[PDB]
């Protein structure tokens, strides 16, 4: 998760907040530092090696200070609906091939240029109702998407009884039609997946799709048999990761910009981000002029991570102790 | 036993919309529910699209 930065961009976690640097006890806790006057702010930051400081902040050149409410950085899974299409026809019409086409894009390379598709396939039969089409529409894309000599999972197929409406019914390649036992199937789900993740390898990622549909033979003419909306999703992905991949890059520059690349020969370093939680960030700008010819600006980003109890507490109060102590202003979330 | 008609005539036995039927050739409506049945036979005369199956009841 490699990033641009503004000359430089600095990360320091916020574990607990102290009045002092006389308890800076434990390898997370912070405190905002400032003179009587306002005229410099820097943080004292306990380090699981000691403590540190970040740089010295001009206040006459804080160009902006802003906080986010941890919600702005989840990534919410794309959601869809496939369905019949009633104008073509409410049901499937015996003797058809009801194909379906799962255009990946962002498949192992990153550019769009990549492309992967997926298929299912349901040859309809006299009798067939919507709800056994749904069913065995699913099971094939399960099928042929999951086979266990397949290295990515690509999408999870789900399936909603119109009793429930609400309760997405899952389908595997393990999955079998005498599990599936409803008869009101109203539609066929398909979403994103969490692709894996890896600290400083493999960043968070994902392969988006559009389902899209294959030609039948209705009274007289080709026509696509179905509809692929997208609907609200109802997952996210908690935001742990990317805060996780910007401490490991954050930390480079304030230390070990190899990170195990001569490997018996490294520095081993230590992060406090725990990927799994959710975090709540402060993001500070300024600059640094110098004297008579050396006008020129230096532009710098000090970057902080609270923790997100949901109610945004400990960012706020850090925000708190920064205003007491800097007379900025930043708002709260 | 022979063929019914010229082939100038059975080759414009088609499948497609009721409304852009014209005379000098029949439509076949194939049935959906069912693969294979077929639901009607039907020939232009007036502008309507009548039937050439005759209708049977019980």
Not at chain 1, 195 to 217: D, E, K, R, S, Y
Request: net charge negative; aromatic share 8%; with cysteine.
């Amino acid at each position: 998760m490699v990033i641009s930065i503004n000359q430089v961009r600095q990360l320091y976690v916020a574990k607990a907040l102290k009045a002092n640097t006389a308890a800076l006890t434990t390898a997370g806790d912070i405190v905002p530092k400032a003179d009587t006057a306002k005229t410099t702010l820097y943080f004292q930051s306990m380090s699981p090696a000691g403590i540190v400081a970040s740089d010295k902040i001009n206040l006459k050149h804080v160009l902006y200070a802003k906080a986010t409410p941890s919600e702005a950085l989840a990534h919410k899974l794309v959601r869809y609906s496939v369905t019949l299409d009633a104008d073509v026809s409410a049901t499937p019409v015996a003797g058809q091939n009801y194909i379906l086409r799962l255009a990946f894009r962002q498949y192992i390379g990153l550019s769009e240029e990549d492309q992967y598709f997926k298929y299912g396939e349901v040859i309809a039969r006299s009798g067939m109702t919507a709800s056994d089409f749904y069913k065995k529409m699913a099971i094939s894309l399960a099928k042929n998407l999951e086979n266990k000599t397949e290295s990515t999972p690509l999408v999870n197929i789900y399936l909603i009884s119109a009793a429930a409406a609400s309760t997405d019914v899952p389908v595997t390649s393990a999955t079998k039609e005498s599990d599936l036992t409803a008869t009101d199937y109203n539609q066929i789900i398909i979403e994103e997946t969490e692709q894996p993740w890896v600290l400083g390898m493999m960043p968070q990622a994902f392969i988006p799709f559009t389902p899209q549909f294959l030609t039948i033979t209705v009274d007289g003419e080709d026509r696509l048999w179905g509809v692929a909306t997208v609907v609200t999703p109802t997952k996210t992905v908690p935001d742990g990761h990317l805060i996780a991949d910007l401490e490991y890059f954050c930390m480079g520059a304030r230390g070990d910009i190899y990170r195990g690349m001569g490997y018996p020969n490294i520095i081993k370093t230590t992060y406090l981000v725990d990927p799994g939680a959710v975090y709540d960030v402060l993001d500070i700008h300024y600059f640094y002029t110098g004297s008579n010819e050396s006008v020129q600006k230096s532009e710098k980003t000090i970057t902080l991570v609270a923790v997100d109890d949901g109610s945004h507490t400990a960012m706020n109060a850090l925000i708190g102790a920064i205003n007491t102590a800097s007379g900025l202003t930043i708002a709260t979330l | 036993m022979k063929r019914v008609l010229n082939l100038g005539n059975l080759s414009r036995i088609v499948e497609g919309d009721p409304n852009e039927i014209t005379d000098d050739e029949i439509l076949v409506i194939k049935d959906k529910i069912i693969e294979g049945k077929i639901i009607d036979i039907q020939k232009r005369v007036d502008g309507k699209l009548v039937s050439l199956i005759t209708e049977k009841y019980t």
